């Protein structure tokens, strides 16, 4: 664990175009990881602090690039 | 390196341009327009520490 | 801007658009900077004339 | 081409009702025509000028009535 | 009839979530009934007065709880 | 059409020499095209403006090089 706490981020689903959607997503990010890098602005989201990851998907402090990739993925559109 | 070679060659060159007034006037939703937000900037603030 | 050191201002053995300090044609057989850097000044002044 | 430039108009897909949608559309209108008549306001659109039509569907200067019908069509809802 | 006029309520369909929709509904509510209870705020709707019910589903004054349930149901999301 | 009017050019047969004649020709050139490029001087000719081309052979805006060749050809001499 981050052993400090997490920033819990939820992305809400949006329609983008005919047969194109940006799916909702639930991620827990180690506080210091979130603090260091977060490409989240204009993303259609909600956040909150917690002592433990609120979600099944967690990015621990030492994962750095798993999180960066995870952020880019919050903007990805699928079928 | 390849890009620089193409620039030297004049094959691909440096460019800069402003916004058409046709767009700026209606940027970020004026008159029913959409998907056209303004670009933005600001600042961060970080730190370093030492120990004797 | 136009490509300089080309066309009318190009020495037949030159590369068309580049002053090459490692090429005897451009540096007029010069060595060290005492003269190599003069060869560059010559080319600069030659281009200013072409603009006129 | 009109040789006077075009106004490139993009309509963004939006939903209106259950199984009722206003399809996204991409058209180009000769400048001399766009500037003569248009019904695009509050339409959920984006537009830019160009020297040549940006899109495969183009309304030329001598097609005034195709364009008028086309403007109304940008508000049409289908299946 | 209510014999005092009605408030005509229309809601519009909302794409609340991935393949989850709040269908728009058309109801007419006896004016004094509407006045007593109407949980309509943030509902994506339109209203107007009339001397007669405008819509096929009408809640006459002597309904109260059929109406309250019908009213809260305006927010219901289904598949 | 040119949508800017036309310049109508008429030349007359010229008895230039023994068994040599400059073919008389009647052409219409889009106003902006005519204005941009023409050699009609010393052509043994008449000109006039019009809304629509006066003649069966018409050079529109995109005929720049067909027109220039056609223009020089007004002095072509044949049998």
Curated annotation (Swiss-Prot), chains A, D, E, F:
Cross-referenced InterPro entries: Soc, Soc_sf
Gene Ontology cellular component terms for the protein in this record: viral capsid, decoration
Cited Pfam families: Soc
Keywords: Capsid decoration protein, Capsid protein, Virion
Disulfide bond sites: none
Domain of life: Viruses
Gene3D superfamilies recorded: Small outer capsid protein Soc (3.90.930.20)
Coarse class of the protein's main subcellular location: virion
Cell compartment(s), UniProt: Virion
Family of this protein: Belongs to the Tevenvirinae Soc family.
Function of the molecule: Capsid decoration protein which helps to stabilize the capsid against extremes of pH and temperature. Once maturation and expansion of the capsid has occured, trimers of soc attach the interfaces between the hexamer of the major capsid protein. Acts as a 'glue' between neighboring hexameric capsomers. Dispensable for the head morphogenesis and phage infection.
Oligomeric and partner information: Homotrimer. Interacts with the major capsid protein; three soc molecules associate with each interface between the major capsid protein facets.
Protein name from the UniProt record: Small outer capsid protein
Organism: Enterobacteria phage T4 (Bacteriophage T4)
UniProtKB/Swiss-Prot annotation, chain C:
Disulfide pairings: none
Modification after translation, per record: A proteolytic cleavage by the prohead core protein protease gives rise to the mature major capsid protein during virus maturation.
Membrane-spanning ranges: none
Subunit field text: Homohexamer. Interacts with the portal protein. Interacts with the capsid vertex protein that forms pentamers. Interacts with hoc; one hoc molecule associates with each capsid hexamer. Interacts with soc; this interaction reinforces the capsid structure. A total of 960 subunits of the major capsid protein forms the 160 hexamers.
Task of the protein: Major capsid protein that self-associates to form hexamers, building most of the capsid in association with pentons made of the capsid vertex protein and one dodecamer of the portal protein. The major capsid protein self-associates to form 160 hexamers, building most of the T=13 laevo capsid. Folding of major capsid protein requires the assistance of two chaperones, the host chaperone groL acting with the phage encoded gp23-specific chaperone, gp31. The capsid also contains two nonessential outer capsid proteins, Hoc and Soc, which decorate the capsid surface.
Positions spanned in the full protein: 314 to 365 of 521
Name used for this protein in its record: Major capsid protein
Family: Belongs to the Tevenvirinae major capsid protein family.
């Amino acid at each position: 664990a981050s052993a400090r706490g997490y920033v819990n981020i939820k992305t809400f689903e949006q329609k983008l175009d005919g047969n194109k959607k940006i799916e909702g997503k639930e991620v827990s990010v180690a506080f210091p990881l979130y603090s260091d890098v977060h490409k989240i602005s204009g993303a259609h989201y909600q956040t909150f602090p917690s002592e433990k990851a609120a979600y099944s998907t967690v990015y621990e402090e030492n994962q750095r690039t798993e999180w960066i990739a995870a952020n880019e993925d919050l903007w990805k559109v699928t079928g | 390196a390849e890009i620089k070679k193409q620039m030297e060659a004049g094959a691909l060159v440096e460019i800069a341009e402003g916004m058409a007034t046709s767009i700026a006037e209606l940027q970020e939703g004026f008159n029913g327009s959409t998907d056209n937000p303004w670009n933005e900037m600001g600042f961060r603030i970080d730190k370093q520490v030492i120990e004797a | 801007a136009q490509v300089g050191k080309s066309g009318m201002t190009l020495t037949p053995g030159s590369k068309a658009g580049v002053f090459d300090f490692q090429d005897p044609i451009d540096i007029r057989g010069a060595r060290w900077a005492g003269e190599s850097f003069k060869a560059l000044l010559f080319q600069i002044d030659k281009e200013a004339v072409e603009i006129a």
